[PDB]
UniProtKB/Swiss-Prot annotation, chain A:
Gene3D superfamilies referenced in this protein's UniProt entry, alphabetically: P-loop containing nucleotide triphosphate hydrolases
Name this protein carries in UniProt: Cell division control protein 42 homolog
Residues where (Microbial infection) O-AMP-threonine is found: T36
Post-translation changes: (Microbial infection) AMPylation at Tyr-33 and Thr-36 are mediated by bacterial enzymes in case of infection by H.somnus and V.parahaemolyticus, respectively. AMPylation occurs in the effector region and leads to inactivation of the GTPase activity by preventing the interaction with downstream effectors, thereby inhibiting actin assembly in infected cells. It is unclear whether some human enzyme mediates AMPylation; FICD has such ability in vitro but additional experiments remain to be done to confirm results in vivo.
Organism the protein comes from: Homo sapiens
The encoding gene: CDC42
Curated annotation (Swiss-Prot), chain B:
Name of the coding gene: PREX1
Subunit: Interacts preferentially with RAC2. Interacts with RAC1. Interacts with AUTS2.
Tissue expression notes: Mainly expressed in peripheral blood leukocytes and brain. Expressed at intermediate level in spleen and lymph nodes, and weakly expressed in other tissues.
First and last residues shown, out of full length: 38 to 396 of 1659
Subcellular location, record wording: Cytoplasm, Cytosol; Cell membrane
Domain PH: 237-340
Function: Functions as a RAC guanine nucleotide exchange factor (GEF), which activates the Rac proteins by exchanging bound GDP for free GTP. Its activity is synergistically activated by phosphatidylinositol 3,4,5-trisphosphate and the beta gamma subunits of heterotrimeric G protein. May function downstream of heterotrimeric G proteins in neutrophils.
Domain DH: 15-206
UniProt name for this protein: Phosphatidylinositol 3,4,5-trisphosphate-dependent Rac exchanger 1 protein
Length: 180, 344
């Protein structure tokens, strides 16, 4: 008698959704290696003093396979639509690909806008790389604009490396799932 | 001086070992999962079919639910064994995996049947869960299997293969990354990567064409008074559908038009539709009618977004009209593409 919540993490390839899930679920990784596989994992969380089971599902590897992806979407309680803050392409892909898909397959199911790799915002090398394209990282303001426009519950940032705001992302996900 | 180069050199090997180890371990875990699916559920319902059937589990349901999961398992027992053999006793730097991936490529096609069926399976599952004794039974299997209620349910375990098969290429890209250029494994790794990507491509496209076929089946099932051979016999996919005004033999009827590769159908919209007619595109001439034209085909009506269709087999003609220019362009271009592709 403890209700389980299904959280499905989607988004562009190499935004670090797998690294996100792994960093949230466990530590004690030697941290020099980036594991590519995240198996479905149940996590007991405390909300308002009440325990819930957060089921965690990864979608990495299925990016190029549009027909295979929606096999994971049924029975989903909440979606995490991820994009890298140092990758304008992923940011655009949230608008052009992911949100329309998950809203098409699950219209009534809530989804969060997740910005990842915030720790790379102050990386001069990354700033140079983006500067070559006359580009720049995603500002929280712009992303919140996008979130409000696409009717996402809210916009959350996190760094799997720094674990800044990482746990609160999932907390907010569970909260959004528990909306009447 | 050379010690820095040595440090880096070994630092790479560490990572390569990490890759190999992740492959092996995740494989073991996957096989373990499938094994659990077999022993906890299948073996139990097979032990006593009376209870399963009485409590609401016909063999049809089992068959649809689990698909060909046991065949996949039989494949991965052998594949895992091959991996254990190649990585004896533990992953080493000079070990070369690519060939074990290449050796097992054409073995993986088994997945094609599973994924395509899975969409039905889960949709069946949701029904079975609404039945009290069935849901209770399916929980009982989980409990007697030693695993918990909070733990991942049957659904995820059934989902696992489609996740698994799509992850091998990533593993292989990281592996190709950590593999030196002159390393004997390098080309085999690249090749294995390409093969494993092709596998996923085949699975995906298989599911797609299957779904298109099922779309045709559905469309035929929703049409009353169908004449001639079935769409499934002579068609592969639906290209375009829409509403047009049909002027034929003096009659003015608004009809629902469906363009399939090889033929075009028109129906009366009430099943949802009543079959009105079909035309093989191989004997169909579509001729554009300039807007404003009024002839005997159109009974004298002034034409906008209209054209004439000729069934040569019966030497019959009739007028089709749209409400928007975009619709006209749509149908015209679609027919053009169909005819273009049918020849080659």
């Amino acid at each position: 008698f403890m209700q389980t919540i299904k959280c499905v993490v989607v988004g562009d390839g190499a935004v670090g959704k797998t690294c996100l899930l792994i960093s949230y679920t466990t530590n004690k990784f030697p941290s020099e290696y980036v594991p590519t596989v995240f198996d479905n994992y149940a996590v007991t969380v405390m909300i308002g003093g009440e325990p819930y089971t957060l089921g965690l599902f990864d979608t990495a590897g299925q990016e190029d396979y549009d027909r295979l992806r929606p096999l994971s979407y049924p029975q989903t309680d909440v979606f995490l639509v991820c994009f890298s803050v140092v990758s304008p392409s992923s940011f655009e892909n949230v608008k052009e690909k992911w949100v329309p898909e998950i809203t098409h397959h699950c219209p009534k199911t809530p989804f969060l806008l997740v910005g990842t790799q915030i720790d790379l915002r102050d990386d001069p090398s990354t700033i140079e790389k983006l500067a070559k394209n006359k580009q720049k990282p995603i500002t929280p303001e712009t992303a919140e604009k996008l979130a409000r426009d696409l009717k996402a519950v809210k916009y959350v940032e996190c760094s799997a490396l720094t674990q800044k705001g990482l746990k609160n992302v999932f907390d907010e996900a569970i909260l959004a799932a528990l909306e009447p | 001086g050379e010690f820095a180069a040595a440090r880096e050199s070994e630092r790479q090997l560490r990572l390569r070992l990490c890759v190999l180890n992740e492959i092996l371990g995740t494989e073991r875990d996957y096989v373990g999962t499938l094994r659990f699916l077999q022993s906890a559920f299948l073996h139990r319902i097979r032990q006593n079919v009376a209870d399963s059937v009485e409590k609401g589990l016909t063999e049809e349901n089992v068959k649809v639910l689990f698909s060909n999961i046991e065949d996949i398992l039989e494949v991965h027992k052998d594949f895992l064994a091959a991996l254990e053999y190649c990585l004896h006793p533990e992953p080493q730097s000079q070990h070369e995996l690519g060939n074990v991936f290449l050796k097992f490529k054409d073995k993986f096609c088994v997945y094609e049947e599973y994924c395509s069926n899975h969409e039905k399976a889960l949709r069946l599952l949701v029904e079975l869960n609404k039945i009290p004794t069935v849901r209770a039974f399916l929980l009982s299997c989980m409990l007697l299997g030693g695993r918990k209620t909070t733990d991942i349910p049957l659904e995820g375990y059934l989902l696992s293969p489609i996740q698994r098969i799509c992850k091998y290429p990533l593993l292989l890209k990281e592996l190709a990354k950590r593999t030196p250029g002159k390393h004997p494994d390098h080309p085999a790794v690249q090749s294995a990567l390409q093969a494993m990507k092709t596998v996923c491509s085949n699975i995906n496209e298989t599911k797609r064409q299957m779904e298109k076929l099922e779309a045709l089946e559905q469309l035929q099932s929703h049409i009353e008074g169908w004449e001639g051979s079935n769409l499934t016999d002579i068609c592969t996919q639906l290209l375009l559908q829409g509403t047009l005004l049909k002027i034929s033999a003096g009659n003015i009827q608004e009809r629902a038009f469906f363009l399939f590769d090889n033929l075009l159908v028109y129906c009366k919209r009430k099943s949802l539709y009543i079959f009105r007619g079909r035309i093989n595109t191989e004997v169909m001439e579509v001729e554009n009618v300039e807007d404003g034209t009024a002839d005997y085909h159109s009974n004298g009506y002034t034409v906008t977004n209209g054209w004439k269709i000729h069934n040569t087999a019966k030497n019959k003609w009739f007028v089709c009209m749209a409400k928007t220019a975009e619709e006209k362009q749509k149908w015209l271009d679609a027919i053009i593409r169909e005819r273009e592709q049918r020849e080659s």
